[PDB]
Structures are given as C-alpha cells and as structure tokens.
C-alpha cells in the first residue's frame, strides 16, 4: 500500500517539473546580449587587520559601515575599526570551535555559535566596561552552522541536525521549528523585508521559508554536491549559491527556475562564500584555491581577481558599497577597494 | 585626541601576545572511540545534549588537551575539517563487532584533511579475547584466513599460542590497512580498561611524532 501512496507522490513530482519546464521562453544570457560589459575591475588592498592567533571562520559588517567582527578557532571575537585599524573589543569564548558570528542591526549585540550546540548572545553596551553573555540558547542537537538577527529580540539559527529555528531571546525558548531537510543545513540568508528567509543544506537543495507561518514555500534543485554558501539578491526576487563542485548558480524566486550558472574549466576546488554588490551588477565569490574571484552577475565573465596564503573562508560587502572584506585560514583580514 | 583609542588598542594587543604564548606551548589530541568501545574507561585520566567534551591532563610538565565528541549525530564528513591541525588521533576499539571497526578505521585513514596525521590506535578490553579463546571465538567463521595464519615475534610469557595468534591476527588486520598507503604511521598498543601506562604511551608516541617532524624539517632524513 506504501507504493500506492508513493506512486501518487512521484506522480505529483512529475507534474511540477513539467509545468516549470514549459515556461522558459529564452535564457537569461540572451536577454543581456545588447549591454556593454563592465570591463576590467582593479581592486587594491587598503588595510590589513592583524591579531588573530589562528584560522578565521566568520565575519559580519555592522550597519554603521565602519565596524566589523570576526571569529577564530582560538575562541576569540574581535571587533575592529576598519578606518583606523584599531581594536574596539576582544571577547574570549567558552568553546574554542566556533563557526559563526553575526552583528546586531542596531549595534548592541553580537552572537556566535559553534560545534557545541549552543548560540550565545553578548551585550556590548552596558553600564559596566565589559562584554557579558546575556542568553544561552540551547535545544539543537547538531552543531550550529549559521545565525542571523531580525530585531534586538528575534534570531534565526541553523544547525547540523537538519533543522532551522526561530527564537525569542528574553524567554529563551524556541518558538518555531522548520523541518524538511534531509542533510545537515550549512547556511541561510535573510530578506530585505524580513518576512522570508532562504536556506541551503548538504542534501543539495535550497528551500524558502516563511517566518510567521513556519512552513516551507518552494524548493530549488540542480546542484550536484552540498551547498556551502547562499546569498540573497538586493531586490528580493533572486538568490545565488555556491557549492563544492566549483559552480555558482542564480535562481529566480517567483519564476521558480534556474538562471545563468557561473563556472569555468580552470577551477576544480569548491566555493566557500558568495556576496553581491550594492547594485547587483557584480557577484563575488570566495574560492578554495587561495583566491577570490569577482564575476559579472549578468553575463558570467571573470573580471578581476582579489589575490592570501591559504583557503578563503568568508566575505562581505558594506551596506553602502564602500569596500569588501575577506578572511582566510592563515589569519589575516584584508579590505579591498 | 584619538591617542586614548590607540592606547586601548595597544593594551589589547599586549594581552593577545600572552595568549599566543600559552596557545603555542600546548598540544591537542582528538579521540574517536566507537559506540561500545569503552573510551569512558580510557578517559578516566584524572590520576595523572552538549558537544565537545574538553579535558586536560599533563605529564612531566607538558600540557595536553583531549577533545572528545558529543552528540554530533552520525555523519562526520563536515565537522572533521576543523581538526586538520591536531597532533594525533586516538582510536579505541573492542577486541561481529570488528568489521565495522575496520571500515571506520579505513574511512578515517586516507581522507583529504587527515592526510598528515598519525593514529595512536588502542586495543581496549584485552580479556574478552582471552576468555573467548579459552572457552567461543569462532574467528574462522567470519575471518576464513585465520586457519591459514601463523607468525618470529616477541610474545608475552604465560599464554598459550592461540591467544597470541588471535592478538597479532587482529593487529595485522589493522597494520596492513595502515601500510596500504609514508606521511604518517600507526601505533598499535594492547591495553586494558584499568591501566597505568596510558598517559606514558601517549607521551612517547607524541614525542616520536614531533621528533620525526623536526628531522623532516632540517632534512636529517
């Protein structure tokens, strides 16, 4: 009797694919033939942020467009001042294997979670002169893989037990749980309107969720291997991924299909991070062969290379589009402009 | 006046220097015991839904650092990347609850992030094998080449040849996997749950590992 139900399910999966496929009038590449290319982009390193004992895992810009935070295997969070290279804070952690960090939209909190299944919240602006942990969110089973702030109150976490979550900081209790992934989830990104968020997992699929109703909405497939990084288009209607098979793809949101792929035959290593420019004209991706490449988001042309002594692990583009920050496994952060 | 900001930055850097010294003088170790393998006994090293279970122990003024692993589900494909720099890996196995152990051993061997890391393999509970041999150990049932096997070596006195045959049979079943690759080496030991020399064995093994590293550095070999 299981097959009966199974047959009907595969039956549905058959209808979805055919209906989606019978919509492509023309490709994204054809529609951009008329336009002149960006050309050649030369970026020169301006600063070099030093101080980390060991390999770097994450970073996140501040809304102030001047400050940034970074995390390392040592168990350190350091908040920099990207204009004058000073150090503002240096926070030591309880667990040394940390994989994520995020910087609050209002600039009051920073959070980080790692391989010990707990997301920690630190209070930066207090009547004392120290940074204290104010909440320890527990309830996941696998390691945390990403976290992002909504307000001074609500946070979204991704873990290694194939679940996402939405929390409530003052109560400290899980509010909504998003289930449906098969493999462990590697990254997530938010949306400009803070109503939807996307996620990418190691079962080679990406799903779009709704925060209020706590249920899945769509599903995009096409990647051969697991997903390492996901980013969201500034408009709110597209997003791009980066996987272990040396490919970065772009998916439409309300068209529910697969647009231009960004790949070349000289790369065999995978991608660790992706990010956009303010106008969405350039997609820049951090690679595994010690190099970071920048792409034209509309025609897939390599235009510029940001040449680190080890694997590149994180990226970032400032809210107002000044500069780009990169981190790596040899422990130095560089700001390209 | 940003001079006070510069002073704050300099004090932070001064503390980071001390942290670097302490970090650089220490040694890290990963433990990868099996499900029923009694690593709970081997972690009894006080007499010298969480995750990583950090412990610390020192012998003869050298600081060690052993990280167990907690509730990280079942797959180790992704979180094994974080341990690309440890000094050694410490198996614990039980002496058919052996075939899956061999498969796990060969999977942890010949990875892409554990290419240059040596394994300190432990054989735990070496009384189960003795009692099975003396009484129930039909090794030939699932290991047919046991019958056509024999050693010269340096056995331990007060034992029948059967127990030693079994012991070096298992030891060879691991050593052949180790040798079928010379960037790293396996270190098989026959130990028991309640022992005394475990820390000494780990000490000598790490000493040999970094001695080989230094000899490689100045091309003495």
């Amino acid at each position: 009797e299981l097959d009966q139900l199974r047959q009907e399910a595969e039956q549905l999966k058959n209808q979805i694919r055919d209906a989606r496929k019978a919509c492509a009038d023309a490709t994204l590449s054809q529609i951009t033939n008329n336009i002149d290319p960006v050309g050649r982009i030369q970026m020169r390193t301006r600063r070099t942020l030093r101080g980390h004992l060991a390999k770097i895992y994450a970073m996140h810009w501040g809304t102030d467009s001047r400050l940034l935070v970074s995390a390392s295997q040592d168990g350190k969070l350091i908040i920099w001042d990207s204009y004058t290279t000073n150090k503002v804070h240096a926070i030591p952690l309880r667990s040394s294997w940390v994989m994520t960090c995020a910087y609050a939209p209002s600039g009051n909190y920073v959070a980080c979670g790692g391989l010990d299944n707990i997301c920690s919240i630190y209070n930066l602006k207090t009547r004392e002169g120290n940074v204290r942990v104010s909440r320890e969110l527990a309830g996941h089973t696998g390691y945390l893989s990403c976290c992002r702030f909504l307000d001074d109150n609500q946070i979204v976490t991704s873990s290694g037990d194939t679940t996402c979550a939405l929390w409530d900081i003052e109560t400290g209790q899980q509010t909504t749980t998003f289930t449906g992934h098969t493999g462990d989830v590697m990254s997530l990104s938010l949306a400009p309107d803070t109503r939807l968020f996307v996620s990418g997992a190691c079962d080679a699929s990406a799903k779009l969720w709704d925060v209020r109703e706590g249920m899945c909405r769509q599903t995009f497939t096409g990647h051969e291997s697991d997903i390492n990084a996901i980013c969201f288009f500034p408009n709110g209607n597209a997003f791009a991924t980066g996987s272990d098979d040396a490919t970065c793809r772009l998916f439409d949101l309300r068209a529910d299909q697969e647009l231009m792929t960004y790949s070349h035959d000289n790369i065999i290593c995978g991608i660790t991070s992706v990010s956009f420019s303010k106008s969405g004209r350039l997609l820049l991706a951090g690679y595994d062969d010690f190099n970071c490449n920048v792409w034209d988001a509309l025609k897939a042309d390599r235009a510029g290379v940001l040449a680190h002594d080890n694997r590149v692990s994180c990226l970032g583009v400032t809210d107002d589009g000044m500069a780009v920050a990169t981190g790596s496994w040899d422990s130095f952060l560089k700001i390209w402009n | 006046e940003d001079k006070a900001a510069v002073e704050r930055s300099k004090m932070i850097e001064k503390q980071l220097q001390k942290d670097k010294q302490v970090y650089r003088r220490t040694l890290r170790l990963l433990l990868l015991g099996a499900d029923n393998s009694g690593k709970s006994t081997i972690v009894k090293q006080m007499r010298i839904t969480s995750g990583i279970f950090e412990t610390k122990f020192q012998v003869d003024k050298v600081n060690f650092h052993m990280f167990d692993v907690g509730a990280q589900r079942d797959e180790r494909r992704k979180w094994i990347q974080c341990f690309n720099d440890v000094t050694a890996i410490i198996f614990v196995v039980d002496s058919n609850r052996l075939q899956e152990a061999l498969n796990d051993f060969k999977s942890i061997w010949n990875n892409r992030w554990l290419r240059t890391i040596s394994v300190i393999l432990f054989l735990n509970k070496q009384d189960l094998l003795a009692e099975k041999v003396l009484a129930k150990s039909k090794i030939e049932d699932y290991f047919p080449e046991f019958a056509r096997y024999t050693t010269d070596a340096t056995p331990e006195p007060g034992e029948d040849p059967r127990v030693t045959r079994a012991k070096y049979f298992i030891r060879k079943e691991f050593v052949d996997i180790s040798t079928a690759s010379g960037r790293h080496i396996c270190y098989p030991h026959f130990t028991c749950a309640v022992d005394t020399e475990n820390a000494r064995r780990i000490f000598n093994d790490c000493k040999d590992i970094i001695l080989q590293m230094n000899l490689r550095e100045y091309n003495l070999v």
Partner: single-chain antibody
Amino acid sequence: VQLVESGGGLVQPGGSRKLSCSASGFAFSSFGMHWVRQAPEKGLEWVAYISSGSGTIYYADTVKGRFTISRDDPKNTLFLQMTSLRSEDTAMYYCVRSIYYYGSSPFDFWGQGTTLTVSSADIVMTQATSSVPVTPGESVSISCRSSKSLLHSNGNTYLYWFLQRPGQSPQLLIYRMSNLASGVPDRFSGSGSGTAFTLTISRLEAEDVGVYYCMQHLEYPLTFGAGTKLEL
C-alpha cells in the same frame, strides 16, 4: 556603578594631603580617570588625568610640580597627592570616569565630591550670559561662544554640556555637540556651526532648573565655561 571619595578637611598652608576616590561596581581597570575642581562661587576647572594603563599623565598648567596622581588597580582605588598648599586650593574636588573608543561617551559618571579648606595659547570658552528668567512650559535657549574652531579634520566637533543640578553632582547631557546621553529625557538638543553653539530645551519642568556648563575637549588644557543659572 558608584564612586565614593575620601579625604578632605582643613589644612594649614604649606602642608600635604592625599585624596582618594574608591571605585566599586564596575571595571576600574578599563576606564581613564580625571579630577575636576569647583571653586565655591565659580565654575568647574580641570586638575589632572591618568589613563587606563598608567602610560599617560597630564597636568593643568596652574599646578604641575606640586600635584601628582596615581592609581592602584588590584584594590580599585584612585589617589591624588598634593604638596605646598597655597590659598587657591580651597575648593571641591570630583573624580570623573571616562572611556575612550569609537562611539563611547566620556565624562558620563561623576563622583560625589569632597571639601577642602586652606586657612595663554589654550582655548578660551565664554558664555553670553549668566542668568535668564523663564516660565515652565515653553522652550529656552542657551548660547556658548568659542575662541577657536573646535571642528577637527576627521569630522567630530568636541563640545559637552553638563547641567549641574543645584545641590548635587554634575551629570552629562550632550557629548560632541549633537549626541545625547543615555538616561536624559528626550527634550534636549544641540547644534552648532564651528565657533558658535546653542542648547535648546523644548519643554520645561521642575527638574530643569540648575546651572549649565560648556566644556571643550580638543586639547589637553581644558577650559570650562562660566555657567548660566536658570531661576524659577
């Protein structure tokens, strides 16, 4: 967060005294510390300064070889040692907290004070008036005048307003001429052009009466203003 000062008394001229400000309730090892003097019938006046790591010390030009300042981090105690007391050192002394990093608010918390009785090229800050009569329920304005451009190359404008209530220690209202403190009600504002500054209060209640002070922080000599009392 509370600081309590000890010492004081009546001293004959030519003697020496050791004042103390004991800190309890925060991280005393991460804050710069000052000392600020108040003559009985005049505005405030700067005295000394010692930074967090004891690596930098400045003194006011009035007394430089007679006063010395030191700190003791493990016990959370701040010391001032003074020698050869003239007839001018007969005023109130306050110990003031200060922390300097991008976005911080210096001079935010003030001590309680201690009493003591004895038997050139720096920027000049002046205030237009010294009193003003008003009525509750309408806006007021206070004007401050500078003798040099306080605006710096980076873009900051270093001006502070304190508003000492009549009977207790001073507080902080506006730091760097535009930014607001933490616990102050949201009816205060500040504006300026580079040499002339104005402070506006939209409403007015019974807690707004007091004396308002105009401090600059561009260079070490710190020149305080005169003060405009609001009488109701």
